[PDB]
Amino acid sequence: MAALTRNPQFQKLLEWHRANSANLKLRELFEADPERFNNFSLNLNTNHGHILVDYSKNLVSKEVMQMLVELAKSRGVEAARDNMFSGSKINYTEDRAVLHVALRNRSNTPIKVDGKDVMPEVNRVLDKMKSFCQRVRSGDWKGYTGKSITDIINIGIGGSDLGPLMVTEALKPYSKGGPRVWFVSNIDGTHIAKTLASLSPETSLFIIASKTFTTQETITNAETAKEWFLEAAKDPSAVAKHFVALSTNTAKVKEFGIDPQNMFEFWDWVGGRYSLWSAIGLSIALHVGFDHFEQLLSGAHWMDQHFLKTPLEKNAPVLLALLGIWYINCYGCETHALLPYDQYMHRFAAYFQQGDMESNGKYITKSGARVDHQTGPIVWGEPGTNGQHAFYQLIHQGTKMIPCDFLIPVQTQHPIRKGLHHKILLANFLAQTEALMKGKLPEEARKELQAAGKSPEDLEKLLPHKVFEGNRPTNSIVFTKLTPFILGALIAMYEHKIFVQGIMWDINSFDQWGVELGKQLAKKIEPELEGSSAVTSHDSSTNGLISFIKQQRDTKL
Amino acid sequence: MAALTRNPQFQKLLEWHRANSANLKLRELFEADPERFNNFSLNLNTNHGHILVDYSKNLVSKEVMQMLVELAKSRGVEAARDNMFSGSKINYTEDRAVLHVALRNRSNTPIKVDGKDVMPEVNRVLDKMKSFCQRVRSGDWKGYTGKSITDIINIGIGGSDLGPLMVTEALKPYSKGGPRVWFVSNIDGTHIAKTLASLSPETSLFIIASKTFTTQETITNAETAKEWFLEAAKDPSAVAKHFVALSTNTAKVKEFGIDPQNMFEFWDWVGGRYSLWSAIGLSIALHVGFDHFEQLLSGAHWMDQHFLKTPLEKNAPVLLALLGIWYINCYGCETHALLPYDQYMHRFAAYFQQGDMESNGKYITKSGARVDHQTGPIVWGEPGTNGQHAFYQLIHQGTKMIPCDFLIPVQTQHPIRKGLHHKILLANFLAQTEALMKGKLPEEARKELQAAGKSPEDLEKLLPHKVFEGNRPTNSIVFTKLTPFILGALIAMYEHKIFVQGIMWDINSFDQWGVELGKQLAKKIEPELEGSSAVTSHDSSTNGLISFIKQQRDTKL
């Protein structure tokens, strides 16, 4: 088997689930214990706002939580965590440290890799970012015609895109005095084309985000941007005024036409999907200002310290991880829904699709043996209340068990109409988890149908359709306000949840070998598309699709 | 038990799956039969472009497809379809017809409800839409200060939002010379606030989209918009120049204060999640022009006729539906991924989250029996290559089986860099399904590591991590170009897929009782948020969360 399934604490948990889980009813758990909320929630005071992690509406008892905590311990979570924080090379397939925690280490306590403190270099790059932010935001940095920059365009894929996009979207209110920010990520020419259509080459600055500076899609997009730029500027020396790099490849950066002074470095122990805290976050710092960027880092730092210092049984990311293990490995739930009741957080779910799924969508353990159990879930979601009018029908009355995290700030950035909109938003946030837990009994629905004037025959037919079975578990994560600090804390919290789950499954949360095959096959297909000659080098489907492409590309519609 | 599980053709299929499915290996199926693509694909000629539905990379044989088609016949799919098209009241819990097909019935062949042809009224409203679009787009329609309209704002949620938003996004290249379109949907005040911040009351036209005209989010947003407008206009008569309604509820439209001549009517047999084809599509027609809206309808009509007239074994929506049944009810796959390799289609998956999940996320059958089998899947996805660089790690090397539909136009709207971007996009579209099908055997990975010059120890350490198990099934849907017509055909294709699955599960695809409970509970919580006193009326979590809200809402951050 595998490390997890051979673990006696896991076997005990699974056996208990088999024997007892059918008896777990949320309605009954709350009725039996008025202290349930108090005992199954964490009210975290960060000194810059509170984060309430309410996990009480979960299918767990004290005994279940105890078994889960014991499993975390016996899977080595405490030791593994300390190893991450100390710069041990826990990314074992690539033999790398995992040090996104160093990027936001505001305390500056030395963290060594290969015997050398990484903090001086972390802080040097941060200082460089700060100086660049001053130059651009002040208007001192001039474009090729001598005008201040009004637009910043981040070009990057995956981890070089999702974080900066999600964070600038979430922190939009903090962008007064900052340039507009745009994100180009898709190789699909539509993306860069529609972006450039609304820009002036005189006042636009491009941030090319790529560690190697050879990333195909990113560099292609970058080269398209440069071509567009040079059509107007007609001077290759002007490129340095309008293009900067988040990279370590000095030579390639120089060759592109970027001044190497404007290459913002990061390190191999910064995973792409954990990189917004590094140089990769430059577009964030430009948009909302360096002070706000430091606040974002500080919030993550607070959560890192919480994760590091807190006993497992009251440790927010650990508990979220454990509830996930319960639903994934005991209930067999494929998915995890992230439902922020916040329009600014509209890209939060998409972000954690990479953060969670690329980390933990794995099947080989540390020993090299295949898992014989489930690993990472499919993450998905849309903001409330919109989701209520799209897919909550299935959550309430479908055939899937779907653990959901509901998230909301207490204070809105836009308290319009004396708080009326936010009052309604909050009411829905609370009602939905209540509804998912309680459901609606036949006796409740029957009375409603009778009052509605339904005939005995119509009532009988309609009754089962109107019943809500309930017993659908949720987490409610509520925070004072979505500030840079609080957002930082929330992202870090999920980062550490993902870490804990990865350790428990005995997988590597920090590599991504599963992207390789698609890349290899794409490189082979690219040159085959040119010209009218038949392609026969693949399976008949790939061949047939290519044939269709060649036949249909000249058709006039 | 339920109709599906009692069905002998279903039990035959499931028994076959149990005995034979482990012997289905895609790589070997393709190697053994050069005709596989030919035998398991449909090349549809619409006379306005081709749609290739390639289902050959699925875990199916001729025998499987035969059994599925036989099951469709046994479940009365053709009769149920004919009943939909004829105006039979197949929405049995609400006693309503289901006639989104009437909305786009370009043939104008009578379709009767209660003995009365619906087509005259369908066409009357379409004519009203056409006339209104001409007046606004030409600049003839003037605001309260005598200026042409520059901005249209759709206010609506769910079915009154997702379609118009998805379609205007997808058809963006067709919007030249149209007014800017905005979508306000969330009750979250952020949504309307940041929209109004960018607008002038003098040049903005609001479109209040609501079937019932009583949805709290929509009416509240609409009232906020009206208040903002009237603060500037200071004249109630001016509202008629700036507010129109799309609804079935004349009385509530009048009550809100909208001119009866400013109401674009639809009917109870138009489901919200099937409503973009109706008056609800007004924002589409305004943005891209009524001619392009007619083309969208015409494409849907083509697909309607395809669905109606084609033998099941060669019927695109039927085959897509059957493959889904295979994966859901035999393999037990919770999810269905929609992955359009098209940035314009970035909201396609979100649209079908409602279309699919609100339709088929059900648990009660026509007989009144609770299902003892799975119904609708969780739909999710991001456009390629964005999703590709976020979560494909899990699709390739996780522990979940995830049916994926890959979609792409052969011709891009933006053939920049002499087609370079689209070449890369196409190569990745093709390579990913190739990779998912083929995988990479241990011996193949071994040879690669050998060639890289890895030591025996390093090779052995890395080997298992480099293996791709493959055998991951996909559909590839490729079409000449994403025109209004082709988009209409594609949306209708999935609508009918959803219909077929619903009939086979014996559920009602056209009601949505599951949204009621959340609405009820939110109304109760609303007034409880007012004031500083503790709430004790609910379970301890709901109470505790309310306590947190009250304690945290006055903290200065």
Swiss-Prot record, chains A, B:
UniProt GO molecular function: carbohydrate derivative binding; cytokine activity; glucose-6-phosphate isomerase activity; growth factor activity; monosaccharide binding; ubiquitin protein ligase binding
Major subcellular location class: cytoplasm
Keywords assigned: Acetylation, Cytokine, Cytoplasm, Gluconeogenesis, Glycolysis, Growth factor, Isomerase, Phosphoprotein, Secreted, Ubl conjugation
Modification type N-acetylalanine: residues: A2
Disruption phenotype: Embryonic lethality caused by impaired gastrulation. During early development, the egg cylinder fails to be divided into the three cavities, suggesting a deficiency in extraembryonic mesoderm formation resulting in the failure to form the amnion or chorionic mesoderm.
Primary enzyme class: isomerase
GO cellular component, as recorded: ciliary membrane; cytosol; extracellular space; myelin sheath; plasma membrane
EC number from the UniProt entry: 5.3.1.9
Phosphoserine modified-residue sites: S86, S107, S185, S455
Pathway as given in its UniProt record: Carbohydrate degradation; glycolysis; D-glyceraldehyde 3-phosphate and glycerone phosphate from D-glucose: step 2/4
Record-listed N6-malonyllysine modification sites: K454
PANTHER family: GLUCOSE-6-PHOSPHATE ISOMERASE
Protein family according to the UniProt entry: Belongs to the GPI family.
HAMAP family: G6P_isomerase
Entry protein name: Glucose-6-phosphate isomerase
Native species: Mus musculus (Mouse)
